[PDB]
């Protein structure tokens, strides 16, 4: 169970509660990318240099096809087994493959028909001079085509049509080709060493197209709402289906799974405070996000997940375990909670939660302007609470604030709870501590062997 | 205290001493950003598409205003309490708020007059077609306006004025709008889930404007000197003051606090060396930067701070604590210092400090070309020192170097000091070690319970 | 030694074996960069503003020269010692210097002749209006010159030649200059606080030139093959040789060392699996990459290295040590291996290696469609193996797969091996555990002092 009162009295302030959702139904769509530049706009006087580019990309495209070769042949179906819905893998010659590799192979075997249809239609597609446009199909999936930055190359031909010779245009087109090749090598193409794994992020694709990804979502029919959460989660991934060395034809996957809310799922947000013990500033180590799910305490990492005031969805769902000490600290037990020292000049001395303020007067001033009696605090107090019964307007530091009324009798007063011993969090300090523990283990082993040698 | 001789004899070379400064007087300036495109340059034949954009940004701007709503109403002042300089908060209905949230609310309540003045002047500001310009006010703060990349859109209209139809211009302007929207979503706007927190960095603003930030600093009147240190520290932050859904009007904060030098503040720089014990290469684990302040040993993290040869300023001032073992190792005690093994082919065998060289001859060659006697070293030596008394020119590896004279009698010779046991620094090794310690804790608890059951 | 069978039976699947290479023969080439804008294209009516830029860069260039001053004077040679191939350093006045600083000083002393030749030829080089071109020399090294983005500035002068006044052109050129200055400050120039250290990466240089680096490699004569591995390793570094404050003349180093294959060098790739113990999912902690070298177990970090199916080369070659527990777990000992709990919805239940599948039927369904007997598994089984002797086609989850034949008699069956106790990997959990260990150390010390006080 979770005890909010215990966390409040320790020094941990509750934030906001969020829900948890799980992605499902991984529907996928294919996108076509052509490495060959468009035949319009660019003149043929530099096309010889283009031939060199045709070789250069080949040096990058020939091995990639070799990666795809001998892989699709390991999956087959229909050999007198049409009743089976799935396909029987024959990865004996493949040697080594993972679960992700097997799933990618199954997807490739399923989408081989679409890949062949796209390859057949490539002859007509190559004649499309439009910059960005949609593409119909057999009514199974809708495709699209984009001319990339090369479509803007014509915009650089209107100036100095005949003032600059063909050499300058060739140099400019070579510079543009080198820039595109460098961008592809940085965040596309052979960046993923294994093309049978779905690990392509939308950030790389955006960086290829000058940090833009809205066009693909609009073409595929995305949802305007919760766009920031989807972008932060990065649930959309991509993989290579087929590659054409001669034509520079590649296919990219776009997955838009639907989110389903987990019943009775709750995630808690907490923040620490800078309380006082004796003339010094102290803080408590507590994770900002706590996972509860269906009444089962667990740990979760929100570093690579979304942070929203109403929903928290993790793309990987690590679901890390939680130690017994952390569980005890979270529940109604304060002896298992650790504390650290803070020397920062600016600290969150006060905080607000559920209409109630939390701070300490051992280091910050406390005085009710409505009463002549100056508010004080005993030296053996860690935390304090304020209510409208004592005073209406309170002042912390140079900031005035007012609170409401307690939910019950309001007997919080200034109750304090003891905590565990402090310890350093620095990596070097942890290393020194564990080295000392290992050194003491020698004496421990010596005592153990002494207790079983002549101890009688 | 700090013992430089002990560090030198252990194997730690002193670098350079730096000062420490603290930011203060957080003066703030407001900057106005208009999401609506300029009325000049772009033709009206695509303005219908602009209307769709007017809806799209609304889907991103409507919730943000809801974030600002019901927040400023929680702070009020002047209700028969004009004598009070501050404002009395009424965050009872707010529910949960942090110290940063309270400070942001106070700042918003103070700057509401400026926000209202800016909103009133927006009618005249919208008629300003200038790309980048300044803006006067009531003589409290100076503002500015910038047309962003949209001002360059007109530069794309000079080519093909009538050769390309309105459809191409509309497509280009839509592509530009999508790129700007994607950039804003990446490094602006709703990236910060809580708009009542000052966590906007200048790097994001620069990425919005193609990695450029000098114009804002020049307009605000920054200081040319120490610009690199200010950029590295990132002391300038921003926050949202008000948002206009219809007009796309937003305000950004720019803080330029003044740095005050802490009296008697010193920060030390140290580097490790690759010494020898017996035919093997060994290194010592010591932090590169050591914080001393006003004669009080402490730990500091310079990863997110500045690194300058004359001053070190940390933006967050973590001021992490230091373990007793680290303090003992830093001072005149060598038994608390740990060592590790290094197998790298290239290592810093030699180093220079205060005109004195430090190296070991157990693995590197040592020979004075001015003397026929070949320099040697005993097998039980860890470190060695050289001086002009023995030879004038020394050779380490294939590099010749010369030193000066010692500060005193020069009796350093080849004194060595013992160190503690070694240990691995890898995370997996640390995990295995702590798992073994936990396993041994079972036997420890068994022995403890045996010692209190029948041990008599 | 390495036991692949032990790893397979524990739950660790072998991947692919790679080689290891070491860089050598660090040949270096110089590249010239001119900060002064080209005299062609830009009109003189804005040149006055350029003068201000001439001052601005000076504020950034004057200290840098001071960094180079008094440094080259500390290295000298030829003073009646021409027979010596090296140079004798005189860094007594330098005070503090590292091994990298000494190497950089030696390189500067060696290349001072080339630097002087470049400075002398700068007078003729400044008259070169070509965008990018090569540059001959004394036949020791080939240089090059590049006009950067400024060469495209003329492309912005063709539109509105006389429609826009000189003020607009000056504003545009000032904006471009500010953008270039910001980019330089971000990823060039004074970013490296110590200019006597080689720590400039090619990523920063590419970011200066819009993420492009192929032109420099093509000019210097790079190798088309293994380009991705070279880019990932980042073996090419740079350093500042000389700086001209007035002319904005700087030199950058480009190193292209040759890779030599280490004899009998092997690096192993491994992946974990999600096995079962009793109705729960469990995983094993094992590093993905294992270093073996010439029959010597060691640890290596591939995070900042290359990942290729045929070769793995580390730029820094950390060569971290390995704990005894990890060595025991890797070899034929399972008691030293640790395990963790995983609650993720999607886990790699099955895997393939050497034509053999590995999975568990305790949580996933197992049934041979060719036989009416349903495949089952005992509750006390952790891992299982499948072969063509029992069934030809196997099904895991909703995926069908087939295997070949065992290398020997095929008596793997479903043998299981015990593992060590589990432990949490979270940093907070580790901190709590070490705090508890430190607390127990107090009782341990009390028992130790009791055993030497009156224990008789």
JSON list of N, CA and C in Angstrom, two decimals, chain C residues 352-391:
[
{"chain": "C", "resi": 352, "resn": "UNK", "atom": "N", "xyz": [17.97, -18.10, -31.62]},
{"chain": "C", "resi": 352, "resn": "UNK", "atom": "CA", "xyz": [18.58, -19.07, -32.51]},
{"chain": "C", "resi": 352, "resn": "UNK", "atom": "C", "xyz": [20.09, -18.88, -32.52]},
{"chain": "C", "resi": 353, "resn": "UNK", "atom": "N", "xyz": [20.82, -20.00, -32.53]},
{"chain": "C", "resi": 353, "resn": "UNK", "atom": "CA", "xyz": [22.28, -19.96, -32.55]},
{"chain": "C", "resi": 353, "resn": "UNK", "atom": "C", "xyz": [22.80, -21.29, -33.10]},
{"chain": "C", "resi": 354, "resn": "UNK", "atom": "N", "xyz": [23.66, -21.21, -34.12]},
{"chain": "C", "resi": 354, "resn": "UNK", "atom": "CA", "xyz": [24.29, -22.38, -34.72]},
{"chain": "C", "resi": 354, "resn": "UNK", "atom": "C", "xyz": [23.25, -23.40, -35.20]},
{"chain": "C", "resi": 355, "resn": "UNK", "atom": "N", "xyz": [22.14, -22.89, -35.73]},
{"chain": "C", "resi": 355, "resn": "UNK", "atom": "CA", "xyz": [21.09, -23.77, -36.21]},
{"chain": "C", "resi": 355, "resn": "UNK", "atom": "C", "xyz": [20.27, -24.44, -35.13]},
{"chain": "C", "resi": 356, "resn": "UNK", "atom": "N", "xyz": [20.40, -24.01, -33.88]},
{"chain": "C", "resi": 356, "resn": "UNK", "atom": "CA", "xyz": [19.67, -24.59, -32.76]},
{"chain": "C", "resi": 356, "resn": "UNK", "atom": "C", "xyz": [18.84, -23.51, -32.08]},
{"chain": "C", "resi": 357, "resn": "UNK", "atom": "N", "xyz": [17.61, -23.85, -31.73]},
{"chain": "C", "resi": 357, "resn": "UNK", "atom": "CA", "xyz": [16.70, -22.91, -31.09]},
{"chain": "C", "resi": 357, "resn": "UNK", "atom": "C", "xyz": [16.78, -23.08, -29.58]},
{"chain": "C", "resi": 358, "resn": "UNK", "atom": "N", "xyz": [16.54, -21.99, -28.86]},
{"chain": "C", "resi": 358, "resn": "UNK", "atom": "CA", "xyz": [16.55, -21.99, -27.41]},
{"chain": "C", "resi": 358, "resn": "UNK", "atom": "C", "xyz": [15.34, -21.21, -26.91]},
{"chain": "C", "resi": 359, "resn": "UNK", "atom": "N", "xyz": [14.55, -21.84, -26.05]},
{"chain": "C", "resi": 359, "resn": "UNK", "atom": "CA", "xyz": [13.36, -21.24, -25.47]},
{"chain": "C", "resi": 359, "resn": "UNK", "atom": "C", "xyz": [12.93, -22.10, -24.28]},
{"chain": "C", "resi": 360, "resn": "UNK", "atom": "N", "xyz": [11.82, -21.71, -23.66]},
{"chain": "C", "resi": 360, "resn": "UNK", "atom": "CA", "xyz": [11.26, -22.45, -22.54]},
{"chain": "C", "resi": 360, "resn": "UNK", "atom": "C", "xyz": [9.75, -22.57, -22.72]},
{"chain": "C", "resi": 361, "resn": "UNK", "atom": "N", "xyz": [9.21, -23.73, -22.37]},
{"chain": "C", "resi": 361, "resn": "UNK", "atom": "CA", "xyz": [7.79, -24.00, -22.50]},
{"chain": "C", "resi": 361, "resn": "UNK", "atom": "C", "xyz": [7.01, -23.75, -21.21]},
{"chain": "C", "resi": 362, "resn": "UNK", "atom": "N", "xyz": [7.68, -23.26, -20.16]},
{"chain": "C", "resi": 362, "resn": "UNK", "atom": "CA", "xyz": [6.98, -23.02, -18.90]},
{"chain": "C", "resi": 362, "resn": "UNK", "atom": "C", "xyz": [5.99, -21.87, -19.01]},
{"chain": "C", "resi": 363, "resn": "UNK", "atom": "N", "xyz": [6.25, -20.91, -19.90]},
{"chain": "C", "resi": 363, "resn": "UNK", "atom": "CA", "xyz": [5.36, -19.78, -20.12]},
{"chain": "C", "resi": 363, "resn": "UNK", "atom": "C", "xyz": [4.83, -19.69, -21.54]},
{"chain": "C", "resi": 364, "resn": "UNK", "atom": "N", "xyz": [5.58, -20.17, -22.53]},
{"chain": "C", "resi": 364, "resn": "UNK", "atom": "CA", "xyz": [5.15, -20.16, -23.91]},
{"chain": "C", "resi": 364, "resn": "UNK", "atom": "C", "xyz": [4.64, -21.54, -24.31]},
{"chain": "C", "resi": 365, "resn": "UNK", "atom": "N", "xyz": [3.67, -21.56, -25.22]},
{"chain": "C", "resi": 365, "resn": "UNK", "atom": "CA", "xyz": [3.08, -22.82, -25.66]},
{"chain": "C", "resi": 365, "resn": "UNK", "atom": "C", "xyz": [4.10, -23.61, -26.48]},
{"chain": "C", "resi": 366, "resn": "UNK", "atom": "N", "xyz": [3.98, -24.94, -26.42]},
{"chain": "C", "resi": 366, "resn": "UNK", "atom": "CA", "xyz": [4.86, -25.84, -27.15]},
{"chain": "C", "resi": 366, "resn": "UNK", "atom": "C", "xyz": [4.04, -27.02, -27.64]},
{"chain": "C", "resi": 367, "resn": "UNK", "atom": "N", "xyz": [3.98, -27.20, -28.96]},
{"chain": "C", "resi": 367, "resn": "UNK", "atom": "CA", "xyz": [3.17, -28.27, -29.53]},
{"chain": "C", "resi": 367, "resn": "UNK", "atom": "C", "xyz": [3.68, -28.59, -30.93]},
{"chain": "C", "resi": 368, "resn": "UNK", "atom": "N", "xyz": [3.93, -29.87, -31.19]},
{"chain": "C", "resi": 368, "resn": "UNK", "atom": "CA", "xyz": [4.33, -30.34, -32.51]},
{"chain": "C", "resi": 368, "resn": "UNK", "atom": "C", "xyz": [3.08, -30.69, -33.31]},
{"chain": "C", "resi": 369, "resn": "UNK", "atom": "N", "xyz": [2.84, -29.95, -34.39]},
{"chain": "C", "resi": 369, "resn": "UNK", "atom": "CA", "xyz": [1.66, -30.19, -35.21]},
{"chain": "C", "resi": 369, "resn": "UNK", "atom": "C", "xyz": [1.72, -31.53, -35.94]},
{"chain": "C", "resi": 370, "resn": "UNK", "atom": "N", "xyz": [2.91, -32.11, -36.10]},
{"chain": "C", "resi": 370, "resn": "UNK", "atom": "CA", "xyz": [3.04, -33.39, -36.78]},
{"chain": "C", "resi": 370, "resn": "UNK", "atom": "C", "xyz": [2.73, -34.58, -35.88]},
{"chain": "C", "resi": 371, "resn": "UNK", "atom": "N", "xyz": [2.57, -34.37, -34.58]},
{"chain": "C", "resi": 371, "resn": "UNK", "atom": "CA", "xyz": [2.30, -35.45, -33.63]},
{"chain": "C", "resi": 371, "resn": "UNK", "atom": "C", "xyz": [1.11, -35.08, -32.77]},
{"chain": "C", "resi": 372, "resn": "UNK", "atom": "N", "xyz": [0.24, -36.07, -32.52]},
{"chain": "C", "resi": 372, "resn": "UNK", "atom": "CA", "xyz": [-0.94, -35.83, -31.69]},
{"chain": "C", "resi": 372, "resn": "UNK", "atom": "C", "xyz": [-0.58, -35.59, -30.23]},
{"chain": "C", "resi": 373, "resn": "UNK", "atom": "N", "xyz": [0.57, -36.06, -29.78]},
{"chain": "C", "resi": 373, "resn": "UNK", "atom": "CA", "xyz": [0.96, -35.87, -28.39]},
{"chain": "C", "resi": 373, "resn": "UNK", "atom": "C", "xyz": [1.33, -34.41, -28.14]},
{"chain": "C", "resi": 374, "resn": "UNK", "atom": "N", "xyz": [0.70, -33.75, -27.16]},
{"chain": "C", "resi": 374, "resn": "UNK", "atom": "CA", "xyz": [1.04, -32.35, -26.88]},
{"chain": "C", "resi": 374, "resn": "UNK", "atom": "C", "xyz": [2.34, -32.25, -26.09]},
{"chain": "C", "resi": 375, "resn": "UNK", "atom": "N", "xyz": [3.25, -31.41, -26.56]},
{"chain": "C", "resi": 375, "resn": "UNK", "atom": "CA", "xyz": [4.53, -31.22, -25.88]},
{"chain": "C", "resi": 375, "resn": "UNK", "atom": "C", "xyz": [4.30, -30.48, -24.57]},
{"chain": "C", "resi": 376, "resn": "UNK", "atom": "N", "xyz": [4.89, -30.99, -23.50]},
{"chain": "C", "resi": 376, "resn": "UNK", "atom": "CA", "xyz": [4.77, -30.41, -22.17]},
{"chain": "C", "resi": 376, "resn": "UNK", "atom": "C", "xyz": [6.16, -30.21, -21.58]},
{"chain": "C", "resi": 377, "resn": "UNK", "atom": "N", "xyz": [6.20, -29.67, -20.36]},
{"chain": "C", "resi": 377, "resn": "UNK", "atom": "CA", "xyz": [7.46, -29.41, -19.68]},
{"chain": "C", "resi": 377, "resn": "UNK", "atom": "C", "xyz": [7.23, -29.48, -18.18]},
{"chain": "C", "resi": 378, "resn": "UNK", "atom": "N", "xyz": [8.20, -30.05, -17.46]},
{"chain": "C", "resi": 378, "resn": "UNK", "atom": "CA", "xyz": [8.10, -30.16, -16.02]},
{"chain": "C", "resi": 378, "resn": "UNK", "atom": "C", "xyz": [8.21, -28.78, -15.36]},
{"chain": "C", "resi": 379, "resn": "UNK", "atom": "N", "xyz": [7.61, -28.66, -14.18]},
{"chain": "C", "resi": 379, "resn": "UNK", "atom": "CA", "xyz": [7.65, -27.39, -13.45]},
{"chain": "C", "resi": 379, "resn": "UNK", "atom": "C", "xyz": [9.04, -27.05, -12.93]},
{"chain": "C", "resi": 380, "resn": "UNK", "atom": "N", "xyz": [9.94, -28.03, -12.86]},
{"chain": "C", "resi": 380, "resn": "UNK", "atom": "CA", "xyz": [11.29, -27.78, -12.38]},
{"chain": "C", "resi": 380, "resn": "UNK", "atom": "C", "xyz": [12.30, -27.68, -13.50]},
{"chain": "C", "resi": 381, "resn": "UNK", "atom": "N", "xyz": [11.92, -27.04, -14.60]},
{"chain": "C", "resi": 381, "resn": "UNK", "atom": "CA", "xyz": [12.79, -26.88, -15.76]},
{"chain": "C", "resi": 381, "resn": "UNK", "atom": "C", "xyz": [12.94, -25.40, -16.08]},
{"chain": "C", "resi": 382, "resn": "UNK", "atom": "N", "xyz": [14.17, -24.99, -16.38]},
{"chain": "C", "resi": 382, "resn": "UNK", "atom": "CA", "xyz": [14.48, -23.60, -16.70]},
{"chain": "C", "resi": 382, "resn": "UNK", "atom": "C", "xyz": [14.63, -23.37, -18.20]},
{"chain": "C", "resi": 383, "resn": "UNK", "atom": "N", "xyz": [15.39, -24.23, -18.89]},
{"chain": "C", "resi": 383, "resn": "UNK", "atom": "CA", "xyz": [15.62, -24.11, -20.32]},
{"chain": "C", "resi": 383, "resn": "UNK", "atom": "C", "xyz": [15.35, -25.46, -20.97]},
{"chain": "C", "resi": 384, "resn": "UNK", "atom": "N", "xyz": [15.10, -25.42, -22.28]},
{"chain": "C", "resi": 384, "resn": "UNK", "atom": "CA", "xyz": [14.81, -26.61, -23.06]},
{"chain": "C", "resi": 384, "resn": "UNK", "atom": "C", "xyz": [15.43, -26.47, -24.44]},
{"chain": "C", "resi": 385, "resn": "UNK", "atom": "N", "xyz": [15.61, -27.61, -25.10]},
{"chain": "C", "resi": 385, "resn": "UNK", "atom": "CA", "xyz": [16.18, -27.67, -26.44]},
{"chain": "C", "resi": 385, "resn": "UNK", "atom": "C", "xyz": [15.32, -28.55, -27.32]},
{"chain": "C", "resi": 386, "resn": "UNK", "atom": "N", "xyz": [15.30, -28.23, -28.62]},
{"chain": "C", "resi": 386, "resn": "UNK", "atom": "CA", "xyz": [14.51, -28.95, -29.60]},
{"chain": "C", "resi": 386, "resn": "UNK", "atom": "C", "xyz": [15.41, -29.44, -30.72]},
{"chain": "C", "resi": 387, "resn": "UNK", "atom": "N", "xyz": [15.03, -30.57, -31.32]},
{"chain": "C", "resi": 387, "resn": "UNK", "atom": "CA", "xyz": [15.80, -31.17, -32.39]},
{"chain": "C", "resi": 387, "resn": "UNK", "atom": "C", "xyz": [14.85, -31.90, -33.34]},
{"chain": "C", "resi": 388, "resn": "UNK", "atom": "N", "xyz": [15.35, -32.19, -34.54]},
{"chain": "C", "resi": 388, "resn": "UNK", "atom": "CA", "xyz": [14.55, -32.87, -35.55]},
{"chain": "C", "resi": 388, "resn": "UNK", "atom": "C", "xyz": [14.20, -34.30, -35.18]},
{"chain": "C", "resi": 389, "resn": "UNK", "atom": "N", "xyz": [14.88, -34.89, -34.19]},
{"chain": "C", "resi": 389, "resn": "UNK", "atom": "CA", "xyz": [14.57, -36.26, -33.79]},
{"chain": "C", "resi": 389, "resn": "UNK", "atom": "C", "xyz": [13.17, -36.36, -33.19]},
{"chain": "C", "resi": 390, "resn": "UNK", "atom": "N", "xyz": [12.78, -35.37, -32.39]},
{"chain": "C", "resi": 390, "resn": "UNK", "atom": "CA", "xyz": [11.46, -35.40, -31.76]},
{"chain": "C", "resi": 390, "resn": "UNK", "atom": "C", "xyz": [10.38, -34.90, -32.71]},
{"chain": "C", "resi": 391, "resn": "UNK", "atom": "N", "xyz": [10.59, -33.74, -33.32]},
{"chain": "C", "resi": 391, "resn": "UNK", "atom": "CA", "xyz": [9.63, -33.18, -34.26]},
{"chain": "C", "resi": 391, "resn": "UNK", "atom": "C", "xyz": [10.38, -32.35, -35.29]}
]
